[PDB]
Design a protein around this ligand. Structure first.
Ligand code: HEM
Ligand code: HEM
Ligand SMILES: [Cl-]
Ligand SMILES: [Cl-]
Ligand code: NA
Ligand code: NA
Lengths: 713, 713
C-alpha cells in the first residue's frame, strides 16, 4: 500500500503530536495510576518477585538457578536508553515492551525476562504498571542477592504505543561507524541527541569501538555515552562494576543460529524472538550477545570479586564460541562456577569494556578506590542505580510508595517545601493589578512567563516554572531569554513581591516563581482587554523558589532552548528545517497540533519573539490578543518569496502593488503551507473565530504554565 | 530518522484505528456540525458563490470569465474517488484538501479552485464545512450556467487529517498497467477495492486505456470504473456528457513546464502547486491535464451541443499542444469560442473517452436517446449529479437543510418512517423473556444480532441493523450469515413479534429490526448470568423494517463480509494476511484498538464463530460472558505451532505434556503476538479485569448495535 510518507518522504510529520490519544488507551478516561498504585500491597509484590528469582522455567532455564542477573540487565536496559539531550528514552514509560526497543539486538532475550514477569503482572493488574514492575524487579534481584538498594519510587504509568524517538539514521542494525548514515563525524563526535555508538545498542560495543578490542579507546566511548545519559565517571564505574558483579553473558555457539527478533518473528512465537537452532537453544546453550563471560566466583551474590579479578590478574585477548573478542585471565585457576554443570569451573573472564575500568587512567583511580574500599563501592552503586532508574521520573512529587528515599539529591532539581499560607483569588487579583500598574508591558510579561515555563519537557519531566530558576545561573544568561531584558523584569517583579509580602500578616507570602507566572497571566489578560475582550486567565499558586546551591548548573545546560519556534528563535544554523524543530518542541511541551497552532499565533501578536523581531508579527495591533496572525497569513492578497540574503526568511508583498507588508521565517509560513496545519490556521482565521481563538489561547497558555505542577496532580 | 515501518515494513498497522482523535481536531469535543449548519444562512452563501463565479482573480484567471466549469470539475473530483467495494473515498469528508488527493495529478489546479473559495469559507466559518462547500459550489456553478439541480443536503462534517485509504501499490504516479505493482491482472481485471485505472486518476485515462486512443476499449474501462463507483450505463453517460457540456481542458504547452504538486512545493507556494514556466503559466496558457479540448459552442451555458457535436461530425485523431492524444471534427468550421481572445475560434474537439459514448454500442443507444430527447438527458444528469455527490452520505436522516429532495431514492437504502408508539422498558423486558423462553441459545442470539448490525461501514454510512435487511435477499443467503441457522432464528423471532404485536392496542408494535437487536441483547444478558453476573445491556428502539423493493440486491452485494475476523470467518484465500483484514473491518466499524480487542475476545466465548468453529474459543464455559479468551491466550503454559495441513491454523499444546489444548487462526493469535495488541490483551487477561471486561464488552456491543442510528444522533 503506497502512503503519503512514500510519496513525500521529507514533508513534516505531525503524527508525533497525536500519539497517546485516548483511542489507543484501554483504561478508562478517569483511570488514575497513582491512586491504584497507592493501594498496591508492595510488600506482597516483592515477596512474589523474591520467590520468582529461584523458580526456573524450562523454556528459559535460570543460570545458576537464579534469574537475578537477567533481571538486573533487564532493568538497567529499561533505563539505559535515556539521553540528556532531549530527555527521551529511559524506564519511565515501559517502552521496552514496544517497538523498536523490544527488538533491539542489545535487548535480545529480555523478551524472556519480561515473559517471566507476566504471572505477577497478571496477579496485581492495574495496580502495578509494567514500567514500575521492570525497575522493581531489578531492585528485588539486587536485594535477594545481598545488596542494599537506596530505595524505590512507583508512579511510572504505562503507555500503550511506541514513542516516536530519533534513534539514528542507519538502515542496518548495529552498522559500524562511517557508513552513509554515520552517527559520527569529525574526531569521533557522536551526533546529538544520540547516546549510543551503534544502532540498537544501549551504550557502547562490548568488544570495543566498531569492534576493535582496545580498552583505552573503548573508555572514550563509555565516558562519552554515559555522560550523554547524565552519569559522571564515579557513577559510571560504580554502575558497570556493580552490574558485572552478577550473572553472566551468553555466547555458547555461533550467532547465525539465532533467528528473527520479536517484531519479525512468526505469529506462533507469541511475542518472543531470537529463537536459536544451537543445541537446546537456551540455558547452557544460550546465545544473547555472542560473548561468553562470567565475571565473579559467586554470580548470584553481592561481593567485591569483580575488582578483585580485574586487578588480581593479567588479561589475554581471546574469542568466544561465537567468535567475539573477549578476555581471559592469564595463568588462572578454574574458580568461576558453571551456570548448569556443578562439576565444571572456568577461568575468570572480562569484556574489553570491563578492562576499560582499569586501563583508562581516570577510571583506574576510581576503580582502585572502590577495590580498596568496597563499602564506598556499594554506596556509590546504590546511589547510581537509584539515579539510573529514576532519572526520567520528574519532580519528587511524582514519587509514590513506602520506599522513597528521604534524601534530596541535587540531580532531582529539587523544589523546597512550602511552609506558609498561599495567596487566594483576591490576592491574585491585587497582584495582577500591581503588575500592570508597574508599567511592565504585555510583551515583557508574556515573554518572561514563557521563558520560565517553556523549559519543561514531558520526556523526563524536567524543567518548568516551578523553582524560579529563570533567575539563577544558567537560565538567567541564556540567549533565548534575553538576559538584560529579563533582569529588568525580574527586578521589578521582585520589588512587587517584597512589598506584597511585607504587608501581609499571618505568614502568607507569594513566591517569585508564582509571581512570574501570575504576571504572565496579567499580561495575557491585558492583551485580551487591548483587543476589547475581558477574560480571566486561571492561576494556581504553590510554586516555590529554589536556590542556586540547589541547582546543578551543568545538568541544567541540556534544557537550554537553542531552537524555540514559539519565540521565532534559532540560536544557530541547523541541518534539520526549523519547522521540524517546532514540532519537536511542541512534542516536548505535550502540545497537540491545534494547541501548538493557537499558541504560536497568539505569541506572535503578543510580542514574544526574541529580539523583538518582526518576523511573523502579522498585525498592526501588537500586544492585543487577536487572531490577526491567521487572518493575515491566509490572505491570498499577499505573495511570499524567499529573500536573496537568506533563503529561510520570506517577504510578503501585496500581489497587485508590490508593496512590502510583512516578513516571516519558515516557522511562520509552515502554517500556510502544510496541509494539516493550514487547515488548523483556517479555523482560527475565520470570521467567527475571535472568541474561540481567545478561549483556546488562554487554555493552552494555562496548560503550559502548569506542566510541572505535579503537586496539584 | 529510521522508523518502525522501515525495520518491519510488514508488521500490522494499528494507526488507522487511532486516526481522527480528539488530539488532531481543533473543534471542541462538544462541537456538533449539524447544529451549526442548521443555523447557516444558506441563501446568503449561495448569493456569495454566484458572485464569485465571474469574479476573476489575476493569479488564476477565469476561462470565458466564468469559473463554473472549474468548480464542476472540482466538485465531480471531490465525489469521484468513491469506491463501492469499501465505501472509502467520496466527497463526504472533504478529503481533497489533504494528502494525497490534494496532489493527485488528476486534481491538478483544483488547489486554485479551493483557494478561490477561502474568502467564503472564512466569512461563514464553522457553519459550513469545506466538505459541504465543495459540493454546494458545484451546484451553484451548474445553476449559474442555467442547469437546475435536483437538490442539495448539508451535513458533511470536516475532518482534520488524511484517511488511510489503500489507493494502490504503485510507486510511480500514473504508472501504466503490468508493472511490478500492477492493479490489473488477467483479462483487464482491476483489483478490488480499486476504482481507477492508474495511480492518481479519478476513474479512467482520458487518452484511452494505458494511453492507447481507442474509444471502444476506453468504454470498457469507463463502464468498469463507474460501476465500481455505483453508477450504471444511463447514469454514466448522463454524467460524462453533462459534465462536458461545460468548460474546457488545459494543455497549452508541454507538461515539462509544470512543477511540483502541492505536497512537494516550496513553503513559499503557500499550499498551491503545479506552478507552470509556460508563458504566463495560467489563463490562456494553462496546463492541467495536457489536453486542449473545448466541447461546446457555449461552455458557460447549459446546452444540448455536446451530443449535437458528438453525432454531427466525424472525428480525426490529433495531438494537443502538449502532445496528448485527442480528437478534432473533420471539416468543421471554427465555431467554438476561445476562453480569452474574442478574435479566435476553434474547431470542435473531443476526448477519446467522450467518443466512447458514441462508439460503444450500449452507450450509443443511450447517447442517441439523450440527443433525441434532451429533457430525458437533463433529468438523468440532475439525478445522477445528486447521486454522485450524496452517495456516501448514509441514511436520509443525516441530510440537512432546506434543499433536500423529498423523493426517496433506491440507492439511499431507504427505511420506512415509524408511525406508531414504540416499545417501552416493560415491553423490552417482556420480549427478552419470551426470547430466552423460546429455546434460542446465547450463541444463536449473539450471532444473529452481530450478523445484522456488523454490515455497517462508516466510510459511506451504509449497512447496520436498521431495516432488518438480514431477512431479505441477499443478506439472508450470505455464507458468513449461516443461512440455515439464520432462517431458524428469524422464524422464531418473527413468531414472537407476531404474537406481541397481535396482543397490543393503541397501535403499538415492535419491528423485526428492533427485535433482532433486542434478542441479541438478551443473549448477552443471559451470557453474563451464565458467568454468575447481573448485567444490563442498553437497548434503543425505533428501527423499522425495509421491504425487499426498498433493497437493491446488486448494491447490497458490496456489503457482504468475505472476511470477518470477529466471527473467525474467511470466505476464501486472500493475498492480504487475515489480521490485516481484521483491522480493516474494525476501521469500517469505527472501533478503536481496545474496542476491537474486547469485542473479539467476548464474541469468541459467546459462540459467534461461523460454523461453530472452535478456533479461538479459549474457554471451557462457552456461552458465558468472561475474559477467558485473554487469560488462556496469554498462558505461557501453552506452546503454539502452525499445522502441517494449513499454515494459517495453529495448534496450542501444553508445553510439558505435548497435549492439544486449543486451536486458533492468525486472527486469534495476533492478540498474543503484536506488541500493542498483546499489551491490550494483558489488561483484559489480568486478575482484576473480569468486571472491566464485561463493562467494556457491553459498551462496545451497544456501540455496534447503534452504528446506523442517525435518527437518534
Ligand atoms: C559499558 C557499559 C556496559 C556494557 C558494554 C555492557 C555489556 C553487557 C553484555 C554484552 C552483556 C551480556 C548480554 C548477554 O549475552 O546475555 C551484559 C550482561 C549484564 N550486564 Fe552489562 N554492560 C554494561 C553496563 C551495565 C550496567 C550499567 C549494568 C547494571 C548496573 C549491567 C548489568 C549487567 C548484568 C547484571 C548482566 C548479566 C545478565 C545475565 O546474567 O543474564 N551492565 N552486559
Ligand atoms: C470518463 C470520465 C471522465 C474523464 C476521462 C474526464 C476527463 C477530464 C479531463 C481530462 C478534463 C481536463 C482537465 C484539465 O485539463 O483542466 C476534464 C474537465 C472537466 N470535466 Fe471531465 N472527465 C470525466 C467525467 C466527468 C464528469 C462525470 C464530470 C461532471 C459531471 C466532469 C466534468 C468536467 C468539467 C466541467 C470539466 C472542465 C473543467 C474546466 O472548465 O476547468 N467530467 N475531464
Ligand atoms: Cl521515549
Ligand atoms: Cl476516505
Ligand atoms: Na524519557
Ligand atoms: Na467514503
Amino acid at each position: 500500500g503506497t502512503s503519503n510518507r512514500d510519496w513525500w518522504p521529507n514533508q513534516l510529520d505531525l503524527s508525533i503530536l497525536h500519539r497517546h490519544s485516548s483511542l489507543s488507551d484501554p483504561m478508562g478516561k478517569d483511570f488514575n495510576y497513582a491512586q491504584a498504585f497507592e493501594k498496591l500491597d508492595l510488600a506482597a509484590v516483592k515477596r512474589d518477585l523474591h520467590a520468582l528469582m529461584t523458580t526456573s522455567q524450562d523454556w528459559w532455564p535460570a543460570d545458576f538457578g537464579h534469574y537475578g542477573g537477567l533481571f538486573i540487565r533487564m532493568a538497567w536496559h529499561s533505563a539505559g536508553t535515556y539521553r540528556t539531550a532531549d530527555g527521551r528514552g529511559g524506564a519511565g514509560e515501559g517502552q521496552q515492551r514496544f517497538a523498536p526497543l523490544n527488538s533491539w539486538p542489545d535487548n535480545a532475550n529480555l523478551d524472556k525476562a519480561r515473559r517471566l514477569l507476566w504471572p505477577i503482572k497478571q496477579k496485581y493488574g492495574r495496580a502495578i504498571s509494567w514500567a514500575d514492575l521492570l525497575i522493581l524487579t531489578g531492585n528485588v534481584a539486587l536485594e535477594s542477592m545481598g545488596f542494599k538498594t537506596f530505595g524505590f519510587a512507583g508512579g511510572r504509568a504505562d503507555t500503550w504505543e511506541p514513542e516516536d524517538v530519533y534513534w539514528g539514521s542507519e538502515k542496518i542494525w548495529l552498522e559500524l561507524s562511517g557508513g552513509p548514515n554515520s552517527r559520527y563525524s569529525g574526531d569521533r563526535q557522536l551526533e546529538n541527541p544520540l547516546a549510543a555508538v551503534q544502532m540498537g545498542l544501549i551504550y557502547v560495543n562490548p568488544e570495543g569501538p566498531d569492534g576493535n578490542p582496545d580498552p583505552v579507546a573503548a573508555a572514550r566511548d563509555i565516558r562519552d555515552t554515559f555522560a550523554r545519559m547524565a552519569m559522571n565517571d564515579e557513577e559510571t564505574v560504580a554502575l558497570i562494576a556493580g552490574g558485572h558483579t552478577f550473572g553472566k553473558t551468553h555466547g555458547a555457539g555461533p550467532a547465525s543460529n539465532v533467528g528473527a527478533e520479536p517484531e519479525a518473528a512468526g505469529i506462533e512465537a507469541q511475542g518472543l524472538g531470537w529463537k536459536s537452532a544451537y543445541r537446546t537453544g537456551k540455558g547452557a546453550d544460550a546465545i544473547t550477545s555472542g560473548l561468553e563471560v562470567t565475571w565473579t566466583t559467586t554470580p548470584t551474590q553481592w561481593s567485591h570479586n569483580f575488582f578483585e579479578n580485574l586487578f588480581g590478574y593479567e588479561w589475554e585477548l581471546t574469542k568466544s564460541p561465537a567468535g567475539a573478542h573477549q578476555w581471559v585471565a592469564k595463568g588462572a585457576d578454574a574458580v568461576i562456577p558453571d551456570a548448569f554443570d556443578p562439576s565444571k569451573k572456568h577461568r575468570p573472564t572480562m569484556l574489553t569494556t570491563d578492562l576499560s575500568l582499569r586501563f583508562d587512567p581516570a577510571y583506574e583511580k576510581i576503580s582502585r578506590r572502590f577495590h580498596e574500599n568496597p563499602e564506598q563501592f556499594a554506596d556509590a552503586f546504590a546511589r547510581a542505580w537509584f539515579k539510573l532508574t529514576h532519572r526520567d521520573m520528574g519532580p519528587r512529587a511524582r514519587y509514590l510508595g513506602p520506599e522513597v528515599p528521604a534524601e534530596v539529591l541535587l540531580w532531582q532539581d529539587p523544589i523546597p517545601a512550602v511552609d506558609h499560607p498561599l495567596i487566594d483569588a483576591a490576592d491574585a487579583a491585587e497582584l495582577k493589578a500591581k503588575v500592570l500598574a508597574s508599567g511592565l508591558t504585555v510583551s515583557q510579561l508574556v515573554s518572561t512567563a514563557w521563558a520560565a515555563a517553556s523549559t519543561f519537557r514531558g520526556s523526563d519531566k524536567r524543567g518548568g516554572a516551578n523553582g524560579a530558576r529563570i533567575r539563577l545561573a544558567p537560565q538567567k544568561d541564556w540567549e533565548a531569554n534575553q538576559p538584560e531584558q529579563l533582569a529588568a523584569v525580574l527586578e521589578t517583579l521582585e520589588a512587587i513581591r517584597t512589598a506584597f509580602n511585607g504587608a501581609q500578616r499571618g505568614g502568607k507570602q507569594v513566591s517569585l516563581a508564582d509571581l512570574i507566572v501570575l504576571a504572565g497571566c496579567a499580561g495575557v489578560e491585558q492583551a485580551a482587554k487591548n483587543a476589547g475582550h475581558a477574560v480571566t486567565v486561571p492561576f494556581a499558586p504553590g510554586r516555590a523558589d529554589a536556590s542556586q546551591e540547589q541547582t546543578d548548573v551543568e545538568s541544567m545546560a541540556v534544557l537550554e532552548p537553542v531552537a524555540d519556534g514559539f519565540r521565532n528563535y534559532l540560536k544557530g544554523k541547523y541541518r534539520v528545517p526549523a519547522e521540524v524543530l517546532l514540532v519537536d518542541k511542541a512534542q516536548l511541551l505535550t502540545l497537540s497540533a491545534p494547541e501548538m497552532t493557537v499558541l504560536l499565533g497568539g505569541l506572535r501578536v503578543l510580542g514574544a519573539n526574541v529580539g523583538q523581531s518582526r518576523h511573523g508579527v502579522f498585525t498592526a495591533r501588537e500586544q492585543a490578543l487577536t487572531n490577526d496572525f491567521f487572518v493575515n497569513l491566509l490572505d491570498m492578497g499577499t505573495e511570499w518569496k524567499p529573500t536573496a540574503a537568506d533563503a529561510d526568511v520570506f517577504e510578503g508583498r501585496d500581489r497587485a502593488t508590490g508593496e512590502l507588508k510583512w516578513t516571516g521565517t519558515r516557522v511562520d509560513l509552515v502554517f500556510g503551507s502544510h496541509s494539516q496545519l493550514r487547515a488548523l490556521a483556517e479555523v482560527y482565521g475565520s470570521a467567527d473565530a475571535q472568541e474561540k481563538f481567545v478561549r483556546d489561547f488562554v487554555a493552552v497558555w494555562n496548560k503550559v504554565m502548569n506542566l510541572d505542577r505535579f503537586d496539584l496532580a
